[PDB]
Amino acid sequence: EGGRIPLWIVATVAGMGVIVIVGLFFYGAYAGLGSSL
Amino acid sequence: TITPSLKGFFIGLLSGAVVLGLTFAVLIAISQIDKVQRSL
Amino acid sequence: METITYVFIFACIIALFFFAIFFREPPRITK
Amino acid sequence: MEVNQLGLIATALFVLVPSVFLIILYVQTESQQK
Amino acid sequence: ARRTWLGDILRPLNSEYGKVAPGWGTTPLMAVFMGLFLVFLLIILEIYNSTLILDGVNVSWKA
Amino acid sequence: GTFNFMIVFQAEHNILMHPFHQLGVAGVFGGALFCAMHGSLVTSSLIRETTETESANYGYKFGQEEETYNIVAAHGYFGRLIFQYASFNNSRSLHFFLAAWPVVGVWFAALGISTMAFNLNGFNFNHSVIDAKGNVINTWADIINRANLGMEVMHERNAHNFPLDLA
Amino acid sequence: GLPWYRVHTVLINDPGRLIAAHLMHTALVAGWAGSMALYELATFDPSDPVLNPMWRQGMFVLPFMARLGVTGSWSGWSITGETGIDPGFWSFEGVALAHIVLSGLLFLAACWHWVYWDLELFRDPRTGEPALDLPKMFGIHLFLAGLLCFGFGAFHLTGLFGPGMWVSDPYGLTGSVQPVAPEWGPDGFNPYNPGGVVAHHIAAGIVGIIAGLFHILVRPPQRLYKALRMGNIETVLSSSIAAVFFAAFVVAGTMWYGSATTPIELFGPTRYQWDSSYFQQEINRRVQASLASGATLEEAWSAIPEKLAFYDYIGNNPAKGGLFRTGPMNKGDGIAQAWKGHAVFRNKEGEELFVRRMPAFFESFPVILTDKNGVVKADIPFRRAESKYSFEQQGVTVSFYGGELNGQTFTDPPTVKSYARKAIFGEIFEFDTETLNSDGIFRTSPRGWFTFAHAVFALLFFFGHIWHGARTLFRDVFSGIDPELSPEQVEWGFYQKVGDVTTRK
Amino acid sequence: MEPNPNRQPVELNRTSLYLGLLLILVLALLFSSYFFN
Amino acid sequence: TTGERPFSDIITSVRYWVIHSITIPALFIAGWLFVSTGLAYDVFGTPRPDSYYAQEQRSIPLVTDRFEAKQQVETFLEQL
Amino acid sequence: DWRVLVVLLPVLLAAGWAVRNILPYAVKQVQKLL
Amino acid sequence: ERGWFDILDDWLKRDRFVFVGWSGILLFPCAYLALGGWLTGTTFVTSWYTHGLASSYLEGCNFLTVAVSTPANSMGHSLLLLWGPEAQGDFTRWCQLGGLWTFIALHGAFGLIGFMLRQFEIARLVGVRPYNAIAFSAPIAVFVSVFLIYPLGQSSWFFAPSFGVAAIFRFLLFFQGFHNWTLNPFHMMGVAGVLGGALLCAIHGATVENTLFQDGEGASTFRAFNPTQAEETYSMVTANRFWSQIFGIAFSNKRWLHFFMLFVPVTGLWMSAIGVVGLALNLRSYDFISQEIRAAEDPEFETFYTKNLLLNEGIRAWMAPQDQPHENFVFPEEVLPRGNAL
Amino acid sequence: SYPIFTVRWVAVHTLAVPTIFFLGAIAAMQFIQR
Ligand code: CLA
Ligand code: CLA
Ligand code: CLA
Ligand code: CLA
Ligand code: CLA
Ligand SMILES: CCCCCCCCCCCCCCCC(=O)OC[C@H](COP(=O)(O)OC[C@@H](O)CO)OC(=O)CCCCCCCCCCCCCCC
Ligand SMILES: CCCCCCCCCCCCCCCC(=O)OC[C@H](COP(=O)(O)OC[C@@H](O)CO)OC(=O)CCCCCCCCCCCCCCC
Ligand SMILES: CC1=C(/C=C/C(C)=C/C=C/C(C)=C/C=C/C=C(C)/C=C/C=C(C)/C=C/C2=C(C)CCCC2(C)C)C(C)(C)CCC1
Ligand SMILES: CC1=C(/C=C/C(C)=C/C=C/C(C)=C/C=C/C=C(C)/C=C/C=C(C)/C=C/C2=C(C)CCCC2(C)C)C(C)(C)CCC1
Ligand SMILES: CCCCCCCS[C@@H]1O[C@H](CO)[C@@H](O)[C@H](O)[C@H]1O
Ligand SMILES: CCCCCCCS[C@@H]1O[C@H](CO)[C@@H](O)[C@H](O)[C@H]1O
Ligand SMILES: CCCCCCCS[C@@H]1O[C@H](CO)[C@@H](O)[C@H](O)[C@H]1O
Ligand SMILES: [Cl-]
Ligand SMILES: [Cl-]
Ligand SMILES: [Fe+2]
Numbered sequence A: 001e002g003g004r005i006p007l008w009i010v011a012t013v014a015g016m017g018v019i020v021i022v023g024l025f026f027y028g029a030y031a032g033l034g035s036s037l
Numbered sequence B: 001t002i003t004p005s006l007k008g009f010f011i012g013l014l015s016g017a018v019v020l021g022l023t024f025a026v027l028i029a030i031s032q033i034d035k036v037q038r039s040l
Numbered sequence C: 001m002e003t004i005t006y007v008f009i010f011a012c013i014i015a016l017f018f019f020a021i022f023f024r025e026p027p028r029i030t031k
Numbered sequence D: 001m002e003v004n005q006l007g008l009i010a011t012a013l014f015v016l017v018p019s020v021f022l023i024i025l026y027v028q029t030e031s032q033q034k
Numbered sequence E: 001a002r003r004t005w006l007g008d009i010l011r012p013l014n015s016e017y018g019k020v021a022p023g024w025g026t027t028p029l030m031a032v033f034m035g036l037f038l039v040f041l042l043i044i045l046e047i048y049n050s051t052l053i054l055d056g057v058n059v060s061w062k063a
Numbered sequence F: 001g002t003f004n005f006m007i008v009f010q011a012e013h014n015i016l017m018h019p020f021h022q023l024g025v026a027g028v029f030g031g032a033l034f035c036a037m038h039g040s041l042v043t044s045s046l047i048r049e050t051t052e053t054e055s056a057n058y059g060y061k062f063g064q065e066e067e068t069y070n071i072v073a074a075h076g077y078f079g080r081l082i083f084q085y086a087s088f089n090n091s092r093s094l095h096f097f098l099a100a101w102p103v104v105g106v107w108f109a110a111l112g113i114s115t116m117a118f119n120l121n122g123f124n125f126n127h128s129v130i131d132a133k134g135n136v137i138n139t140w141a142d143i144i145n146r147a148n149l150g151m152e153v154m155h156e157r158n159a160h161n162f163p164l165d166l167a
Numbered sequence G: 001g002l003p004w005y006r007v008h009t010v011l012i013n014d015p016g017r018l019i020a021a022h023l024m025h026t027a028l029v030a031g032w033a034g035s036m037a038l039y040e041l042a043t044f045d046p047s048d049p050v051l052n053p054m055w056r057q058g059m060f061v062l063p064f065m066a067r068l069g070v071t072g073s074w075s076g077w078s079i080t081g082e083t084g085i086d087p088g089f090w091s092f093e094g095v096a097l098a099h100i101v102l103s104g105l106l107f108l109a110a111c112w113h114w115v116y117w118d119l120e121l122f123r124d125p126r127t128g129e130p131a132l133d134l135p136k137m138f139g140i141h142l143f144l145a146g147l148l149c150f151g152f153g154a155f156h157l158t159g160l161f162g163p164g165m166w167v168s169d170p171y172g173l174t175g176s177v178q179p180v181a182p183e184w185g186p187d188g189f190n191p192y193n194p195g196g197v198v199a200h201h202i203a204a205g206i207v208g209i210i211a212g213l214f215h216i217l218v219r220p221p222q223r224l225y226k227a228l229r230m231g232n233i234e235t236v237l238s239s240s241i242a243a244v245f246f247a248a249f250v251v252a253g254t255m256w257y258g259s260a261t262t263p264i265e266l267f268g269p270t271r272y273q274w275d276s277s278y279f280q281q282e283i284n285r286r287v288q289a290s291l292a293s294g295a296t297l298e299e300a301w302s303a304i305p306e307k308l309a310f311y312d313y314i315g316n317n318p319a320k321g322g323l324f325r326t327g328p329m330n331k332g333d334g335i336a337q338a339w340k341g342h343a344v345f346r347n348k349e350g351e352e353l354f355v356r357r358m359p360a361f362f363e364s365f366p367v368i369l370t371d372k373n374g375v376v377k378a379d380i381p382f383r384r385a386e387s388k389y390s391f392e393q394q395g396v397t398v399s400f401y402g403g404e405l406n407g408q409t410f411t412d413p414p415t416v417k418s419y420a421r422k423a424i425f426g427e428i429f430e431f432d433t434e435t436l437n438s439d440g441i442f443r444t445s446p447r448g449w450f451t452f453a454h455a456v457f458a459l460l461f462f463f464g465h466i467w468h469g470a471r472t473l474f475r476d477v478f479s480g481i482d483p484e485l486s487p488e489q490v491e492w493g494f495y496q497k498v499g500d501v502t503t504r505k
Numbered sequence H: 001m002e003p004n005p006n007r008q009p010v011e012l013n014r015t016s017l018y019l020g021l022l023l024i025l026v027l028a029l030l031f032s033s034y035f036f037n
Numbered sequence I: 001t002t003g004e005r006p007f008s009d010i011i012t013s014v015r016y017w018v019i020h021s022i023t024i025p026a027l028f029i030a031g032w033l034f035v036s037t038g039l040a041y042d043v044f045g046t047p048r049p050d051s052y053y054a055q056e057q058r059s060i061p062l063v064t065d066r067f068e069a070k071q072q073v074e075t076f077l078e079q080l
Numbered sequence J: 001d002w003r004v005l006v007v008l009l010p011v012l013l014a015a016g017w018a019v020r021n022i023l024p025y026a027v028k029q030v031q032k033l034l
Numbered sequence K: 001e002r003g004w005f006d007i008l009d010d011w012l013k014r015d016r017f018v019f020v021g022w023s024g025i026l027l028f029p030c031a032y033l034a035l036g037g038w039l040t041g042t043t044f045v046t047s048w049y050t051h052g053l054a055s056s057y058l059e060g061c062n063f064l065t066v067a068v069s070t071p072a073n074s075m076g077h078s079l080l081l082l083w084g085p086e087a088q089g090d091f092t093r094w095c096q097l098g099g100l101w102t103f104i105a106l107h108g109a110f111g112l113i114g115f116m117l118r119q120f121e122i123a124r125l126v127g128v129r130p131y132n133a134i135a136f137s138a139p140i141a142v143f144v145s146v147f148l149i150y151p152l153g154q155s156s157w158f159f160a161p162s163f164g165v166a167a168i169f170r171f172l173l174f175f176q177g178f179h180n181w182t183l184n185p186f187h188m189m190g191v192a193g194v195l196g197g198a199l200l201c202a203i204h205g206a207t208v209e210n211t212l213f214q215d216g217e218g219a220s221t222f223r224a225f226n227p228t229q230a231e232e233t234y235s236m237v238t239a240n241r242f243w244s245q246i247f248g249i250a251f252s253n254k255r256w257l258h259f260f261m262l263f264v265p266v267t268g269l270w271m272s273a274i275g276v277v278g279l280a281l282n283l284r285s286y287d288f289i290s291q292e293i294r295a296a297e298d299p300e301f302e303t304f305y306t307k308n309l310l311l312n313e314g315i316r317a318w319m320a321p322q323d324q325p326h327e328n329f330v331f332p333e334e335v336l337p338r339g340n341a342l
Numbered sequence L: 001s002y003p004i005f006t007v008r009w010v011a012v013h014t015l016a017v018p019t020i021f022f023l024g025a026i027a028a029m030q031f032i033q034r
């Protein structure tokens, strides 16, 4: 139904998802492959 | 005779022909189905 | 001769600055 | 310094030929009426 | 305009400005020659490039 | 002397791998891009005020009250080149962007040099990728490193007496 | 008034003065050709086609005259090193004279067409307006182009009525002008097959005659005439420039990679012949064959032609020059005098060592010597304190086979090192560095210079094509857009089809 | 002969002269070192 | 406007998220598995951490022939 | 290869669920155009 | 009149969210594949067999170090088609051979052509002059000279830029060490066009924003503009006076100003392209002969020009063995040029 | 009222679909150890 889930919630959740995934990528810089260790 | 690279050439030639053929077929089809509306 | 040439071109550029600023085509308001 | 002997004439003409061309065009613009 | 002996002889060759064949005319035949020309250029490129290698065609100074 | 400064800077700080210099490049490459963009779009939409034989620049008169190009037409073009909401229709917003993009980028460039001044250097991924046994698997970062080493060992060839170049 | 960058636009509506300007341009170009040839003849030294050929002397037009059969001078020499030959009128000088006379006649014709610009021929018989029927003009010109192209191939290149063209062996040792039969099989499309060149001109010529006839007789489709604006001479400018940049890119490529039409005796070797050690391989093949047949090492190397050794030298690689390193290759390394012979390096244990050659990328290169298995055996150290491989430590010697130094062995470490430094360039030569006050710094050949100018011009002509294409298709808005242009045409949601008013919603 | 009607006056204003001279002089200041080499 | 439904309307609608609470995670998990199963290595020919070198080899398996390049890589991969 | 099926298994189950949730509105769109 | 061509033309030119046009038939597949190829390569594809490098996220590289690397030097200038005589239809081997490089370069090239055709097509339909297409000739001159002409003059594609952040950085440093590219006057004009362009962007934007007429009550001034307004939103007369008094000269003509904004960075990029065409043939501005003659004879003569050559010499010797692995360079420690201590 | 499948829909998905797939792939890579 076109308008039920408020756009500000979608933006906040989408944004948080981006931070989590990019955060995971940064964590990976320090562990496993590409970590220098 | 037909060297392996001449065969490769024909294959690349047919693949491009198929890519272009299908593309224009699909676009011609969609253009005929969804016509623009003009005043008489 | 090279030093003379380089200094000459530079001097000509500085002279050009002077004329471009003080002897410009004056901006005139019209429509 | 052992520079190329044609460097002087090349530089001089490079400056003079187009500079002169512009001066010719400018002056004959100014002398037109209006 | 000035007429000359040569101008009069050549007159017919410069008299059809703007003359066209109707509609699409020979465009379809033009397209086919263009298509064949494209394939031709592709062939000579790929030979020079050693992407298309043919018997008896040694792309080198040694042939 | 400018190029000398740049090469030695790269050797000692790996400036290319520093995000502030990368932002700087984005600022100047983008500033040039947007300059050409704005120039082309305004020029593309100049209103016809001149004949074929005269320069279109005589179509604008210094201090005229009317705008000299059609922004709606410029927007109609650029919005179709990409998509509608990617193009500006507000001139003030457009010009703010033109100011802000290169300025902010060059601020970061300035800050790159000003912070590498205190030896907080570009990213160092030298020997970052290692195989199962522990063999170093080189990346383009390590090839950058080889170039940097060449600059380092050669620069100021008579100036260094001790093994580390600490300033 | 007209801005400076538009002054020549006064010719757009003036066919007669356009022909005059074209005539003047043609006169300038032919005059340049004549001048250039005369300048080259005033400077060229014909005494040594082996070690001082045209391409070592900064000759640019000379190879183009030689390519098509002009090889001799009225003074008696020929580029192949012959004496007492009679070239007839069509010597280098005769070719230069013809271009100068042509230049003059074209200049006079330009003057006539400038003054008598108002010819009835240039006006449309129905409107009295200046008009050129470009579609038919194209057919006429294409037909003539076809005729000339066919005749060039069928008569000149074949030698049927003409001299033929420059051909040579795979190593550029025995080049000469020869009649060439057309190659009609698939090898005609091999860029190194000269028969392909002959076949091209015959076949493309015929196709040009046919298509020319077509274009004279059959009018353009209304739809193509309108789309390509065939009533506007600037459309022809746009498409011609396009064809020209295509052609410019092609001649740059074939000059750089080499082909039957860019022979190494005329333009110099290619960089790729150095990249693949093309001449070194052939030299080695010949030496091995001589040894297998029972010759001594001295006899084996002495049987290597001077000219072949000279190709195996980096100073003749066109990828070793500089943009502002001006003039002949002779101005850099010198006028080559003689091959010093083949340098063979040995350590104290008597094992043969090979100097690592300089790749084209490198303005400078270290001296490193390896055995036949590529293991480092000697070098010239930078830092000395931890040197292990110095010529002094390893007792490196150098012996020469063939050339000036045949039979000699050098043991003095600075002398041996001096020869090793030369060996990074390949085969070692003696040069006259005094005659031209040579500076010791590598310059490119006419192959390099030709390729540079043409790749640059080609790229710039792409902009020209784009510019004049834009001018042709957007002529109606050249002075600006419609002052009454409706917002509906440029806003969204009014027309179903962009810029078509009949499709309004 | 009758005049050629295609003839047109030509112009270069003062600003263009200044811009042109600047281009030329600056190009000369740049390329001159390479000419002297 | 050009006719298509506004993005804001779409991404705030229940039917969008009914569909995409499934399609989005599925694609993410598919990508994950492309790597976790090791299929990514074999599709593209990318060495695993244990397949860059043979145990005693310290020479890079560089391609040196144009037309026998494919066979060279095959030969290199046999030597693992 | 078995991993090809394991990797594309979530994808095909997602495409099917999307079709089931749009088929009444997809048939409606196609019939309107035809 | 209203045949299949005209019907197809109607559909291609529909006013939709993403305009298609005839140019879209070329643009969209080539652009999509170029971008897709890059993302694919940098995520999954190695450079082990062509360069001896890891180059993908899969191998452990990050955003800055991933690349789609050029093919091995032994590939020459092979088009390296999937069905060509090198890969022979094998997708895996094709990736291992650097087939994605020519894939991206070539689709990228036809993509840029499609984009510039798109610029022409849209301009014609909307009825504006095609200056945007014309300005885009500069990005085309750059892509073509650098990614195609440069490697074509060299031994192989190997020496073209690799499609990656750090790989491009490597390309810059290679050009410094081998070509002394900073000394090249065509590169210098490029720098002037880019930095001059960025200057013009900043100064024009700032000038407009600081000579605005008050056309609203808001302290945030953006809402006080209407696209359809006839009036200029800022004062050219005030802008002109400010600059005339600050800098000595100022624009007075708005059409000249905006054309000059096209001209500067467009011309600069064109000049840099010409320089790279020269470098394709090693036709460098590497040296000043007068400087070298003096320095060789006079061991006390030193300039910043001679200092920079020493750096180049270091770059070449230190980077070459790993950067050019097909050469099999072994430079024993003792031959490496080094100053004192370092 | 509004169409569901459009040119815009295709363009969006040609980018969106591989992007999410790729992100899952790169997410998984962060747990790989030598
Ligand atoms: C059987 C008869 C016959 C034979 C034996 C030949 C033989 C030949 N032809 Mg000819 N031809 C013929 C009939 C024949 N032709 C006919 C009937 C026509 C129609 C009129 C032509 C039209 C024609 C053309 C247009 C060309 C030839 C060329 C050639 C040569 C090919 C080898 C070469 O050097 O290519 C080198 C050229 C190529 C490999 C083509 C390059 C294609 C490029 C890549 C296209 C893209 C251009 C674009 C601007 C590039 C920008 C990007 C770049 C800068 C990176 C060879 C001499 C070529 C030539 O003149 O060589 C010197 C050539 O260009 N022919
Ligand atoms: C296709 C063009 C072309 C080519 C490839 C050659 C090639 C050659 N010539 Mg010939 N020549 C030509 C045309 C050409 N020539 C013309 C038109 C003339 C009349 C001027 C001559 C007269 C001539 C003479 C008298 C001599 C040669 C010589 C030579 C050789 C050395 C070249 C050299 O040192 O260049 C040097 C090249 C440069 C220094 C590069 C030029 C770069 C310019 C200045 C760039 C300009 C930049 C521009 C201003 C920027 C604009 C920016 C703006 C748009 C914003 C070489 C074989 C020499 C030879 O050895 O004779 C036996 C020799 O003595 N040539
Ligand atoms: C067959 C080739 C050709 C021909 C016949 C033309 C002809 C024309 N051009 Mg095009 N153009 C070309 C190629 C060509 N162009 C190329 C290769 C480029 C990119 C460099 C351009 C870019 C271009 C632009 C941007 C413009 C034109 C314009 C024009 C028109 C007026 C020209 C004028 O009055 O200049 C007058 C020129 C001078 C008074 C001096 C120019 C000095 C030059 C820059 C340096 C010296 C060059 C030297 C003498 C010649 C070297 C020869 C070279 C080929 C090796 C005219 C229709 C103009 C137009 O469209 O008007 C409406 C215009 O604005 N052209
Ligand atoms: C307009 C869009 C477009 C364009 C311009 C290109 C262009 C290119 N592609 Mg790309 N591609 C596309 C879309 C496109 N592609 C799409 C949609 C896909 C997904 C399937 C691909 C997937 C793809 C792959 C995997 C590869 C390419 C490759 C190439 C290159 C070589 C193509 C070739 O040699 O074909 C030659 C064919 C033609 C030029 C068409 C000929 C049509 C003529 C006019 C008609 C004659 C044909 C006739 C009917 C058939 C009879 C033959 C018979 C005798 C056997 C070139 C850069 C290769 C490359 O990048 O290698 C590095 C490569 O490996 N493409
Ligand atoms: C950036 C590139 C570019 C752009 C934007 C333009 C733009 C323009 N061109 Mg030019 N053109 C170009 C390059 C370009 N051209 C090249 C490289 C050539 C060959 C010399 C031409 C030849 C040309 C002619 C003869 C004419 C134009 C004209 C025009 C105008 C009308 C549109 C048109 O005809 O496009 C043409 C379409 C294209 C350039 C797209 C080509 C797509 C090809 C067919 C894909 C091929 C794929 C290939 C086979 C894959 C294999 C690769 C291989 C390496 C393996 C417009 C100003 C016309 C004009 O001036 O009208 C007034 C005109 O008459 N063009
Ligand atoms: C790096 C660039 C520097 C910008 C920095 C500024 C940061 C601010 C962010 C602005 C970014 C610009 C995006 C504007 C976005 C914006 O701010 O406007 C918001 C806008 C709102 O639209 P609506 O919700 O009204 O829905 C649109 C419909 O109503 C139209 O029918 O949504 C979009 O346009 C995003 C669509 C995503 C695009 C998906 C389509 C993909 C197709 C590919 C495009 C092809 C291009 C053609 C060339 C080949
Ligand atoms: C504000 C934080 C500083 C960031 C820089 C952006 C704004 C300042 C730079 C402008 C210099 C150009 C010359 C003046 C040009 C000029 O005169 O500007 C004029 C322009 C309009 O002026 P107004 O008077 O309408 O508004 C400003 C005040 O009066 C408040 O209404 O000012 C603004 O738009 C300020 C916007 C601030 C809103 C926050 C922006 C934050 C940007 C985010 C950056 C993130 C970086 C990401 C990198 C990875
Ligand atoms: C009239 C006459 C005559 C005569 C003639 C003559 C004597 C001639 C001539 C001529 C000539 C004698 C000529 C010429 C020429 C030349 C030229 C035309 C040139 C040019 C040049 C240029 C253009 C350049 C450029 C450049 C430069 C400077 C530098 C670098 C770059 C370039 C390359 C760009 C006679 C008796 C027969 C008879 C009848 C009449
Ligand atoms: C190659 C190839 C192909 C194709 C393909 C493709 C088409 C692909 C694709 C693809 C794709 C299409 C992909 C994707 C992707 C992606 C991604 C991976 C992403 C991402 C991201 C990110 C991570 C983000 C981030 C960020 C940014 C950028 C900004 C700011 C912030 C942030 C941080 C958020 C084919 C089969 C034909 C064939 C052969 C080859
Ligand atoms: C304007 C000067 C004219 C001088 C003409 C001298 C003709 S000389 C004549 O030239 C022929 C070339 O076709 C040669 O075949 C022939 O051997 C030679 O004697
Ligand atoms: C208009 C003045 C031109 C006069 C020059 C014509 C030279 S004519 C030329 O002379 C050569 C050497 O004697 C002969 O070898 C050759 O057969 C002959 O054609
Ligand atoms: C996609 C390639 C474009 C080539 C255009 C050639 C059009 S061809 C043209 O098409 C008309 C309808 O469109 C027909 O009425 C006519 O019979 C046919 O000759
Ligand atoms: Cl230093
Ligand atoms: Cl110290
Ligand atoms: Fe503006």
Ligand SMILES: [Mg+2]
Binding pocket: A027, A028, A029, A030, A031, A032, A033, A034, A035, K060, L029, L030
């Ligand atoms: Mg990790």
